[PDB]
Amino acid sequence: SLNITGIQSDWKVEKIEFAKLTGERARSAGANGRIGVHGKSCTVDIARITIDGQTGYGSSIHMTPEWAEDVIGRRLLDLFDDRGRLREAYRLQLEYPVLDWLGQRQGKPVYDLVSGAHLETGASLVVPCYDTSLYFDDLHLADERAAVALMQEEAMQGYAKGQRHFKIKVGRGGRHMPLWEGTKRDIAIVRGISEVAGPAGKIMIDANNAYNLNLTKEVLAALSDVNLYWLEAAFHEDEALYEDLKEWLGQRGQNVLIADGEGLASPHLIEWATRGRVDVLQYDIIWPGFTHWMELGEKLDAHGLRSAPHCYGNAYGIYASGHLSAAVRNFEFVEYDDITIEGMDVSGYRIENGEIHVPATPGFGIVFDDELVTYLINRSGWSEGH
């Protein structure tokens, strides 16, 4: 659904440059259900592409100097297929710098270039978001009251910044705490954060597969008074288990969506979703990526299914995810982590009242510090072309 009618055939890839940018998230992220402390440090691998004397920037992965050497000289148009879709071989390495480039050259935000029927030209793009940063930051505290207070204060930091919806890590009893104790702590923490967000705040819980079906049912029942919007990764996806869970929720009149799709997903997950076992699909916004998601999102829309791309671990993906919502009707939320990357100015985006306002400026609306990136390319990155 990309508009590529205005791409001249004389337009060629002149130069490809690469650098890793670094920074930090606002608050160090602790453990989750399956692994240890995530930390405070953040990076974003970036490529700067030069086509017809103009540059575009974006996320770039799986690219080597040798790989990029072979792309120099090519016509932009030959990277696309007739259908208007960037070819598979170029997506992970180049889709973002290319889309940004196209927006810069055409003077349009990417969302305008990939817009679908549900967003009419000229209207501001405002997308729902949630605060994804509520990890197991309480583990060093033995006292439940203190643990709840600490997690409430973390949610409040988000609320103070304009967040209204919160995704809370649960599954403490899977690995990090004794089973029963950790499960009681999960419940106390979720109720606690519920009180910060208030009755209109959507609460998501993510167990990172630390539960089984019966632990999940115990937790859902305990939280029947919380405004639980969705349950994510209760346990590794399994059609029989989710069918059972959906029937149990149905009998209770408990309206909680099932979300899944991150990491090494079941190859049949979308099929299970079309049969009604899973409601929200969560493939990563970087890999498989944006071009993949535009196609997938249309398919899911047709099936009446929901999209919520995963973004954790790459600040750039937050902003990409925002633009993707213009192409996907049943887009749910931007997964938001508060991160400062040196040289990557995202002040064009704003969080207000549980939504992220996407700027109407060209490409992805992110302003990279050209001189800093030039320095980093020299210092530790690389360059192909001239």
* The pair of three-digit structure tokens given for residue 165, joined into one six-digit string: 């919806």
- Give min distance, CB of 111 to Mg ion, in A: 25
Tell me which DSSP letter residue 27 carries: E
Nearer to Mg ion, 167 or 292 (CB): 167
Q: Which is nearer to Mg ion, 233 or 256 (CB)?
A: 233
Binders in 205-234 for Mg ion, by CB under 5 A: 206, 233
Helix H segments across 119-178? Answer: 144-159
The SS3 assignment for 367 reads: strand
Name the amino acid, one letter, at 27.
Answer: R
The window from 6-14, 96-104, 255-263, 361-369 that contacts Mg ion (CB under 5 A) reads 255-263
Find out whether the peptide bond into 288 is cis, omega within 30 degrees of 0: yes
Which two tokens mark 334? 């931007």
Closest to Mg ion by CB, 273 or 358: 273
The string over 148-176, giving b where at least 16 C-beta atoms fall within 10 Å of a residue's C-beta and e elsewhere, is: beebbebbeebbeebbbbbbbbbbbbbbb
Number of residues that bind Mg ion (CB under 5 A): 4
The smaller minimum CB distance to Mg ion, of residues 73 and 313, is found at 313
Looking at residue 263, what DSSP letter applies? S
Instruction: Provide the minimum distance between the beta carbon of 233 and Mg ion in the complex, in angstroms, as a whole number.
Output: 5
Q: Whole-number minimum distance, CB 245 to Mg ion, in Å? A: 13
**95, 112, 237, 338: which one contacts Mg ion (CB under 5 A)?**
237
- Min dist. Cβ of residue 236 to Mg ion (A): 6
How far apart are CB 130 and Mg ion at their closest, in Å?
12
Is there binding between residue 284 and Mg ion (CB under 5 A)?
Answer: no
Kindly state the smallest distance separating residue 169's Cβ from Mg ion, in Å.
8
Fill in the per-residue mask, 57 to 86: x = in contact with Mg ion (CB under 5 A), - = not in contact. ------------------------------
Query: Per-residue string for binding with Mg ion, 188-207, x by CB under 5 A?
Result: ------------------x-
| CA 321 to the chain's CA centroid | 6
Angle at 320 between CA 314 and CA 326, to 5 degrees: 155
Buried residues in 188-226 as b, exposed as e (16+ CB within 10 A): bbbbbbbebbeeebbbbbbbbbbbebebbbebbebbeeb
- Closest-by-Cβ residue to Mg ion is 206
Positive or negative, the CA dihedral 125, 128, 132, 138 is positive
Among 260, 284, 335, 338, the residue binding Mg ion under the rule CB under 5 A is 260
Q: How far is the CB of 260 from Mg ion (least distance, A)?
A: 4
- What does the binding site for Mg ion look like in residue numbers (CB under 5 A)? 206, 233, 237, 260
